[PDB]
Amino acid sequence: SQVRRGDFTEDTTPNRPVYTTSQVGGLITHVLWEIVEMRKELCNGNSDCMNNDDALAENNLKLPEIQRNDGCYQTGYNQEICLLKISSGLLEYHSYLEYMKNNLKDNKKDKARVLQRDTETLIHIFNQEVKDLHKIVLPTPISNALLTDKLESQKEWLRTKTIQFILKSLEEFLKVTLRSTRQT
Numbered sequence: 001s002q003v004r005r006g007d008f009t010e011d012t013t014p015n016r017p018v019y020t021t022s023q024v025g026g027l028i029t030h031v032l033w034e035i036v037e038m039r040k041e042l043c044n045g046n047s048d049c050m051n052n053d054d055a056l057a058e059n060n061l062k063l064p065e066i067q068r069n070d071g072c073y074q075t076g077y078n079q080e081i082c083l084l085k086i087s088s089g090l091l092e093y094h095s096y097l098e099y100m101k102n103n104l105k106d107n108k109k110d111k112a113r114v115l116q117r118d119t120e121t122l123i124h125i126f127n128q129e130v131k132d133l134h135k136i137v138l139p140t141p142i143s144n145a146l147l148t149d150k151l152e153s154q155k156e157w158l159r160t161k162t163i164q165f166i167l168k169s170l171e172e173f174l175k176v177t178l179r180s181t182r183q184t
Helices: 021-041 087-102 106-133 143-149 159-182
Strands: none
Touching: 021 106, 021 159, 087 106, 087 143, 087 159
């Protein structure tokens, strides 16, 4: 429920897991661009599809979305313990892309693999940093079960919905999370 900028979307790829601000940055921008293209690709790369259901879906998603603030506090030490509940989001999104990745086309699979890898990378670095700095705990992903559970379907064009939803949310949550941690 709030328009957000897009900023650059290209910056080549990294060279190795340095676990530095540069490594994470490049991995975020790369994975972000790939996800976006892969998302719209489902609609034959139709710019219309990208902004087709982007009028109500933005405010009708079952998954969580960031929308608190762009900072903790300059002074006063009010409402301590800021920035959290990120492992769950990244966990679900990762399980979604990786889940559908197994059942995809040649191209979709090729790109899907890279998407998952990047996600796990940023998740490992972020989780590690927050793990060393502070604590953290998480139960376990259950959405996977529901998805795999299916509900009357085989090879129809209805899955494009659920997939498009999880994809849109994932990407959005990614860019947002980055901007939040970047404070710029």
